[PDB]
Tab-separated table of N, CA and C in Angstrom:
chain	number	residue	atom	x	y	z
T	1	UNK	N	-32.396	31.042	-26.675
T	1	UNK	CA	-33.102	29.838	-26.139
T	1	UNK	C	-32.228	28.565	-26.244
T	2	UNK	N	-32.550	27.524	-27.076
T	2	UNK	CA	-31.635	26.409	-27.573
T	2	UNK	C	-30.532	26.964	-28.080
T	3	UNK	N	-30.631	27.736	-28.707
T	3	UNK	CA	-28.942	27.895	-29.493
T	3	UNK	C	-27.835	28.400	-28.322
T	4	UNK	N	-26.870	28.230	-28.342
T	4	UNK	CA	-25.930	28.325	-27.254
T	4	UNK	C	-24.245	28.539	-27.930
T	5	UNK	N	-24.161	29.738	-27.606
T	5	UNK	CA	-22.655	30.308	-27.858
T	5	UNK	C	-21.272	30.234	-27.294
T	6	UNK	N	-20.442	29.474	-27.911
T	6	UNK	CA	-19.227	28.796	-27.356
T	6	UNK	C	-18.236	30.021	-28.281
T	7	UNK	N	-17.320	30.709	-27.237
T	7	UNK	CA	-16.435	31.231	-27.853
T	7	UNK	C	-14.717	30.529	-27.490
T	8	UNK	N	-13.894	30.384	-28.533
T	8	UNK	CA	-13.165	29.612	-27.862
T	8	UNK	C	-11.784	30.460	-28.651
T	9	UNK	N	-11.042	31.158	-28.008
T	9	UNK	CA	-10.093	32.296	-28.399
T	9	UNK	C	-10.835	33.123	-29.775
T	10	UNK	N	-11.519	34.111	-29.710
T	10	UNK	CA	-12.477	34.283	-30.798
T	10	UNK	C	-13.035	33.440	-31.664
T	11	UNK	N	-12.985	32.645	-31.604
T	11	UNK	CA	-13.462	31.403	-32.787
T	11	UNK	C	-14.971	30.820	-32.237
T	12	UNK	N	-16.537	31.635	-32.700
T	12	UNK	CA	-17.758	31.293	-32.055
T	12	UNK	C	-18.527	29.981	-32.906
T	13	UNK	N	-18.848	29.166	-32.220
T	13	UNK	CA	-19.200	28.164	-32.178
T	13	UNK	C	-20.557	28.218	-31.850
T	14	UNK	N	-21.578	27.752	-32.472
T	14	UNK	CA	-22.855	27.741	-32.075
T	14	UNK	C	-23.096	26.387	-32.000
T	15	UNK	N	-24.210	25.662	-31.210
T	15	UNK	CA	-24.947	24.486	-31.283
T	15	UNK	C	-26.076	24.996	-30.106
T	16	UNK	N	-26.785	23.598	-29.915
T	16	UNK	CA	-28.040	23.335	-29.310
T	16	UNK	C	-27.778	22.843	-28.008
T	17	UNK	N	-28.527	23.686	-27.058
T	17	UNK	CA	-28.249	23.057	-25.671
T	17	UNK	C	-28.848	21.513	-25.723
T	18	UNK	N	-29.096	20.973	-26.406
T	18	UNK	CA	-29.718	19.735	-26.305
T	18	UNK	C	-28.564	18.864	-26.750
T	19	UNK	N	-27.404	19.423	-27.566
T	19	UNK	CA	-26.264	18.516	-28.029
T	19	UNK	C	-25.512	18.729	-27.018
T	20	UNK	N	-25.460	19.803	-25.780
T	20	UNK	CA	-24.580	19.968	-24.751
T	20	UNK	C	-24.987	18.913	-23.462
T	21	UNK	N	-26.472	18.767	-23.813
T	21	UNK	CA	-26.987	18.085	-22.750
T	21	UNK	C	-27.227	16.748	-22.729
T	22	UNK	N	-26.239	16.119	-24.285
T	22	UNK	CA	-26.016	15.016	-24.598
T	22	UNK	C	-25.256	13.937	-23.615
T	23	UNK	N	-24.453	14.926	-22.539
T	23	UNK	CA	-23.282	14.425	-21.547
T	23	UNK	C	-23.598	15.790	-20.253
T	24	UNK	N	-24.478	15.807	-19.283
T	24	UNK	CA	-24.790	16.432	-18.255
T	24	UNK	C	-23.805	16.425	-17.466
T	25	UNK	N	-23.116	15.605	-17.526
T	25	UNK	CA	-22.079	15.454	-16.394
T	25	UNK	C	-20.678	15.861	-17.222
T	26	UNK	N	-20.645	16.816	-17.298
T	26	UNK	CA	-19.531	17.422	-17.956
T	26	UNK	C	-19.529	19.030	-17.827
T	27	UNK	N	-18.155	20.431	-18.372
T	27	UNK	CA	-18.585	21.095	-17.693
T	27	UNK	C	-19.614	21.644	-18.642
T	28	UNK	N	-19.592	21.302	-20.108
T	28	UNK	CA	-20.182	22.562	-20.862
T	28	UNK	C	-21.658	21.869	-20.334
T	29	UNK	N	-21.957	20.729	-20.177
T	29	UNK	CA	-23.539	19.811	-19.705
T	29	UNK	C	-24.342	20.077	-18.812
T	30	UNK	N	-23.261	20.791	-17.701
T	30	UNK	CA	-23.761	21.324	-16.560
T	30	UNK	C	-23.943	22.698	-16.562
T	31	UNK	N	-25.139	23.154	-15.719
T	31	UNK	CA	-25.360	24.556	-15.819
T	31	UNK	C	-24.262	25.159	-14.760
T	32	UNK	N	-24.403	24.603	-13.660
T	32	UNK	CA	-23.663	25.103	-12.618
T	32	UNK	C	-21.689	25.190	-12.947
T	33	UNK	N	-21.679	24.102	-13.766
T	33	UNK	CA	-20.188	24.319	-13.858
T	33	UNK	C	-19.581	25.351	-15.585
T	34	UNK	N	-20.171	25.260	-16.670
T	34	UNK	CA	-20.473	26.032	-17.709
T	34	UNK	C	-20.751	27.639	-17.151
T	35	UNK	N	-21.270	28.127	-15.799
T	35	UNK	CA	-21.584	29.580	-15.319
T	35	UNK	C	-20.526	30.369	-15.151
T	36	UNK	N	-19.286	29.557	-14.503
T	36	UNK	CA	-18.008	30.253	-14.504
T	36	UNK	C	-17.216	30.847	-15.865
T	37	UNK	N	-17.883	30.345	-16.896
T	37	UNK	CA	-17.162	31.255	-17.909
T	37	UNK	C	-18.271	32.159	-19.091
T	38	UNK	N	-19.465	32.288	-18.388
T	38	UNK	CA	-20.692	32.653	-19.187
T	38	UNK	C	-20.596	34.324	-19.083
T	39	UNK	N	-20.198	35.026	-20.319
T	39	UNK	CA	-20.394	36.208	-20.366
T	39	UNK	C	-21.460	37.213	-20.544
T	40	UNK	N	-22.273	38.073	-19.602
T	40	UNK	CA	-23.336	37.986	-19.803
T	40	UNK	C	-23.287	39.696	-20.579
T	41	UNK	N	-22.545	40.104	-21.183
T	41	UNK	CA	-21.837	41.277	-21.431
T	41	UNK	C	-22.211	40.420	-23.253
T	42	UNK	N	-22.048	39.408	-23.620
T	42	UNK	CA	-22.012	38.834	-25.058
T	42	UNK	C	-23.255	37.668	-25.055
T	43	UNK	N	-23.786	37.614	-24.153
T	43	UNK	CA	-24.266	36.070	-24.058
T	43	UNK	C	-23.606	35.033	-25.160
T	44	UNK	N	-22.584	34.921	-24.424
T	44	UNK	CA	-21.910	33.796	-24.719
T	44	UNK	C	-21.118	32.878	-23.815
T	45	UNK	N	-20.310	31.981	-24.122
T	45	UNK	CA	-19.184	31.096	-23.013
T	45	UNK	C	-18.194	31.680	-23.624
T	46	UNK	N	-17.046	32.156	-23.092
T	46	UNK	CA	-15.425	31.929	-23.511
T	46	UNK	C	-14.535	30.958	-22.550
T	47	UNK	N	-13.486	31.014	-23.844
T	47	UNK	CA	-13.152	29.588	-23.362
T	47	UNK	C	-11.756	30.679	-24.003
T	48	UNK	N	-10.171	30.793	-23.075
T	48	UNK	CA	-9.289	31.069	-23.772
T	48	UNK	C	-8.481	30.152	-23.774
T	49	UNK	N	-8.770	29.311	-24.899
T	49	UNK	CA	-8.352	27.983	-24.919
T	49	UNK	C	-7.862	27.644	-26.715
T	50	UNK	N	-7.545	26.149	-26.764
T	50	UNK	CA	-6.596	25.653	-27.794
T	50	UNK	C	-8.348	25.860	-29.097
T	51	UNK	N	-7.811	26.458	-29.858
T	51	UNK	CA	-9.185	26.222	-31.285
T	51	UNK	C	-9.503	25.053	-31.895
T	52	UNK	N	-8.544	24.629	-32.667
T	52	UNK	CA	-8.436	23.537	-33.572
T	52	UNK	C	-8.903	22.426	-32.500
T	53	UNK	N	-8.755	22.121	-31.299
T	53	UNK	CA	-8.897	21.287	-30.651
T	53	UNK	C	-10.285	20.828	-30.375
T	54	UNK	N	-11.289	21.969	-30.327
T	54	UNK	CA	-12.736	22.154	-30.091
T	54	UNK	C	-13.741	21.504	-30.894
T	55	UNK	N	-13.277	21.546	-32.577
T	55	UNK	CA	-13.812	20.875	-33.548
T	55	UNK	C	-13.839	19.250	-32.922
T	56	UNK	N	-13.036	18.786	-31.911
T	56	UNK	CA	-13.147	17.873	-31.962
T	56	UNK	C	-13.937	17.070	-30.551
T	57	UNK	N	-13.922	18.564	-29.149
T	57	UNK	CA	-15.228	18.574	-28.146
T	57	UNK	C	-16.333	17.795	-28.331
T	58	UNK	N	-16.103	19.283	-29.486
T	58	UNK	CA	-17.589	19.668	-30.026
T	58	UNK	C	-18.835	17.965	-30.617
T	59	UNK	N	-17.682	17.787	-31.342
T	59	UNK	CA	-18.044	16.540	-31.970
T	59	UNK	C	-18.464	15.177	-31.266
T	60	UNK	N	-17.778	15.217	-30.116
T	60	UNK	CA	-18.074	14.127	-28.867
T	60	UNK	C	-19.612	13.930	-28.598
T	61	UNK	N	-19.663	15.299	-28.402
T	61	UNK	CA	-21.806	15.713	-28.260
T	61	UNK	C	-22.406	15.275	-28.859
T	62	UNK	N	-21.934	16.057	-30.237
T	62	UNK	CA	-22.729	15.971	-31.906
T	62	UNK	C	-22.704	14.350	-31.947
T	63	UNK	N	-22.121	13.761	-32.070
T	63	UNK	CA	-22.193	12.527	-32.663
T	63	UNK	C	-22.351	11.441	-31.403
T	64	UNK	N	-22.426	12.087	-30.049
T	64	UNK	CA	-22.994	11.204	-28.956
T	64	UNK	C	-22.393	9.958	-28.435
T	65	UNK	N	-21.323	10.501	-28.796
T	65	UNK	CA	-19.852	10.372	-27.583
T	65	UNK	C	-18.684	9.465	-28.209
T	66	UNK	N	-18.527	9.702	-29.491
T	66	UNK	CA	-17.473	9.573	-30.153
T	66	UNK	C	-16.343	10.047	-29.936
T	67	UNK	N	-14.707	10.086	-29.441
T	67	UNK	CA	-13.753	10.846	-29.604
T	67	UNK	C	-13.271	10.417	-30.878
T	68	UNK	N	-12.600	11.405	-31.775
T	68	UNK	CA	-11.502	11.159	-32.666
T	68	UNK	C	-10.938	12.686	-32.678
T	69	UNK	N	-9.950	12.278	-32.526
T	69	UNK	CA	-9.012	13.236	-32.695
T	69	UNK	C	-8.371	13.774	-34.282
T	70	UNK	N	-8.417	14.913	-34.590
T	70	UNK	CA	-8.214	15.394	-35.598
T	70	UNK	C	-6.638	15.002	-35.804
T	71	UNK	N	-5.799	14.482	-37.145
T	71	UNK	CA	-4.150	14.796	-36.753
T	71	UNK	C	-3.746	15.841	-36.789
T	72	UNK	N	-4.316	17.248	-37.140
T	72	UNK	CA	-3.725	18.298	-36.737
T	72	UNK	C	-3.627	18.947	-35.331
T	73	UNK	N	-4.634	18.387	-33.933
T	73	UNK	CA	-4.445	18.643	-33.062
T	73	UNK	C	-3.710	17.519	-32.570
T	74	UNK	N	-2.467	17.900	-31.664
T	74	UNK	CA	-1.607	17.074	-31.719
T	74	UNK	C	-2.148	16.352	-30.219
T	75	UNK	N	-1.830	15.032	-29.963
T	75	UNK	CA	-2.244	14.288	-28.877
T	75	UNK	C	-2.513	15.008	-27.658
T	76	UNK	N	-1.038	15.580	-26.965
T	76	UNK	CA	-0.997	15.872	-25.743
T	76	UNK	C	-1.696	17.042	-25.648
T	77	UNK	N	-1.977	17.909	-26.300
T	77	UNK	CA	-3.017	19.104	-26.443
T	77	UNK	C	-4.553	18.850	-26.564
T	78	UNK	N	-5.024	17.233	-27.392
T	78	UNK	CA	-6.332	16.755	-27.018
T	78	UNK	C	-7.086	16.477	-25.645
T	79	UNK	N	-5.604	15.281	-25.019
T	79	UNK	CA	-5.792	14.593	-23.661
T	79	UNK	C	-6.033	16.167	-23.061
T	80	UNK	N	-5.608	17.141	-22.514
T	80	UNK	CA	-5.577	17.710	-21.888
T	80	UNK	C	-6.958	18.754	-22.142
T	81	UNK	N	-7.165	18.844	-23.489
T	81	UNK	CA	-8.559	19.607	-23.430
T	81	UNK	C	-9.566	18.654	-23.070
T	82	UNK	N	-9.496	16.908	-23.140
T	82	UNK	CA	-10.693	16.073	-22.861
T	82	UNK	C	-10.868	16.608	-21.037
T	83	UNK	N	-9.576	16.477	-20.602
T	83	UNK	CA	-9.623	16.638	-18.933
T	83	UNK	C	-10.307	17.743	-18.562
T	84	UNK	N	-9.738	19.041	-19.013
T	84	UNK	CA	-10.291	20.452	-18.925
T	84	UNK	C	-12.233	20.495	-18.735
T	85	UNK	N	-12.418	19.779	-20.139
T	85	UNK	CA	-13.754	19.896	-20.305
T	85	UNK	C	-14.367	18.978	-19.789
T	86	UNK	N	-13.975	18.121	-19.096
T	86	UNK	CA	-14.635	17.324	-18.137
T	86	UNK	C	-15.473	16.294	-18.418
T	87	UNK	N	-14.725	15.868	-19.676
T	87	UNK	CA	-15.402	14.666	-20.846
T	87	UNK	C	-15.761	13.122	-19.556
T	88	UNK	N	-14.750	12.906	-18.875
T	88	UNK	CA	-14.566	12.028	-17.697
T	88	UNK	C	-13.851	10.567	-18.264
T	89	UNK	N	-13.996	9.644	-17.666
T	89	UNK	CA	-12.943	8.487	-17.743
T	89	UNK	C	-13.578	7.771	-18.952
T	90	UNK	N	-14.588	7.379	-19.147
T	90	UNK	CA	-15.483	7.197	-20.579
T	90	UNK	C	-14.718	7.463	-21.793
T	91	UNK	N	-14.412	8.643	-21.990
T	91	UNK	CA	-14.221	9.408	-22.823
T	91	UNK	C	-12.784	9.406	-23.136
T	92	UNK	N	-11.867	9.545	-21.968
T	92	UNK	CA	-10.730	9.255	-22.031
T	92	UNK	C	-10.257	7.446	-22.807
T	93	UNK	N	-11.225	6.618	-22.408
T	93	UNK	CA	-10.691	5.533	-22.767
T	93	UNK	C	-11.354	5.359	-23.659
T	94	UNK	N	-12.017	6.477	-24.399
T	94	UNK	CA	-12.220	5.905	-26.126
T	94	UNK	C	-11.587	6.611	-26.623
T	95	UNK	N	-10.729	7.662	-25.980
T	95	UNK	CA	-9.422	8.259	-26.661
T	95	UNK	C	-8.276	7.260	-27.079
T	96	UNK	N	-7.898	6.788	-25.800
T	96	UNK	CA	-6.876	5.749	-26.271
T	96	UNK	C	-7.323	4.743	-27.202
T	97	UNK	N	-8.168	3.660	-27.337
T	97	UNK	CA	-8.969	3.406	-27.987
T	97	UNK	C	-8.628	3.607	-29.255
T	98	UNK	N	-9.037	4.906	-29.389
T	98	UNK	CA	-9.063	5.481	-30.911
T	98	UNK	C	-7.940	5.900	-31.447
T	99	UNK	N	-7.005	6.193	-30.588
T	99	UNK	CA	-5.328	6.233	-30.808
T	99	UNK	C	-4.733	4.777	-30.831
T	100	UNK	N	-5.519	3.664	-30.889
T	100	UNK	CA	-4.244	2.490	-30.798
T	100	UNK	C	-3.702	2.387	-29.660
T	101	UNK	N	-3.838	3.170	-28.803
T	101	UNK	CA	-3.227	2.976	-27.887
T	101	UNK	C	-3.519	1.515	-26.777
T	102	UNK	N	-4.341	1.105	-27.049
T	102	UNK	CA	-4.491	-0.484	-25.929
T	102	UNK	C	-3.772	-1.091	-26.701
């Protein structure tokens, strides 16, 4: 029901479609764009994607649209999972933001 399974290179991730549906316009937010990787063989999502990086997705939701980047995921591997997942321009510029970067 609510609980919702994120697999991201084996590494399963659970939360609440209600923390996914924190940002609709994104892909995990959207039903229609989240379907392309929905395994219905596991009911789950896979994602063969960066791990360490996800803790920090994930967290965008959870905490309702915060970026911070972990320092173990290194910059150019963040920017590129924010794009992937379809965080959008918002999101991107509280990346920089939060990097010092302005």
């Amino acid at each position: 029901m609510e609980r919702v399974v994120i697999n991201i290179s084996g590494l399963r991730f659970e939360t609440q479609l209600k923390t996914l549906c924190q940002f609709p316009e994104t892909l995990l937010g959207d039903p229609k764009r989240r379907m392309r990787y929905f395994d219905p063989l596991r009911n789950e999502y896979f994602f063969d994607r960066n791990r360490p990086s996800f803790d920090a997705i994930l967290y965008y939701y959870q905490s309702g649209g915060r970026i911070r980047r972990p320092v173990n995921v290194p910059i150019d591997i963040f920017s590129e999972e924010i794009r992937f997942y379809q965080l959008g321009e918002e999101a991107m510029e509280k990346f920089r933001e939060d990097e010092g970067f302005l």
